[PDB]
Amino acid sequence: KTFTRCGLVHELRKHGFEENLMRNWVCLVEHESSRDTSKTNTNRNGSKDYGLFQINDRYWCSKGASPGKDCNVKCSDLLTDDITKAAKCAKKIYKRHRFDAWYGWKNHCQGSLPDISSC
């Protein structure tokens, strides 16, 4: 599933993301997955990033059939249209690393942020 900019903002609010941090989250997501819940990316070290928030293989979700890693979730559960599991995990990564955990944010969202006044 691919969200429109405001569709994404709508879902994010629905999952309790801080309203004053919204422009950043939108910037992060648009730069990490283009608001696509099914995007996967394979990195050099052999790890994969899953879904909307491009959550990683090594540290946050398990590729197994059993939930695991720091988010205690199966990576496949982060490729669904429903983002509640991905959202809880993204909030857990943020709570620990702020926005620095995301490459896309780090070097694309330092300057100007998306206009979400229409949402």
UniProtKB/Swiss-Prot annotation:
The yes or no answer to whether the keyword Secreted is present is: no
Keywords in alphabetical order: Antibiotic, Antimicrobial, Bacteriolytic enzyme, Disulfide bond, Glycosidase, Hydrolase, Signal
Q: Name one Pfam family in it.
A: Lys
* Reaction catalysed by this enzyme: Hydrolysis of (1->4)-beta-linkages between N-acetylmuramic acid and N-acetyl-D-glucosamine residues in a peptidoglycan and between N-acetyl-D-glucosamine residues in chitodextrins
Task: Please provide the Gene Ontology terms (biological process) for this protein.
Answer: defense response to bacterium; killing of cells of another organism
Q: Main EC class of this protein?
A: hydrolase
Q: Which GO terms describe its molecular function?
A: lysozyme activity
| SUPFAM superfamilies documented for this protein | Lysozyme-like
Query: Which InterPro entries did the record assign?
Result: Glyco_hydro_22, Glyco_hydro_22_CS, Glyco_hydro_22_lys, Lysozyme-like_dom_sf
Q: Which SMART domains match?
A: LYZ1
Q: What is its EC number?
A: 3.2.1.17
Give the matching PANTHER family. LYSOZYME C (PTHR11407:SF63)
* Family listed: Belongs to the glycosyl hydrolase 22 family.
Q: State what protein this is by name.
A: Lysozyme
Source organism per UniProt: Bombyx mori (Silk moth)
Q: What phylogenetic lineage does the species belong to?
A: Eukaryota, Metazoa, Ecdysozoa, Arthropoda, Hexapoda
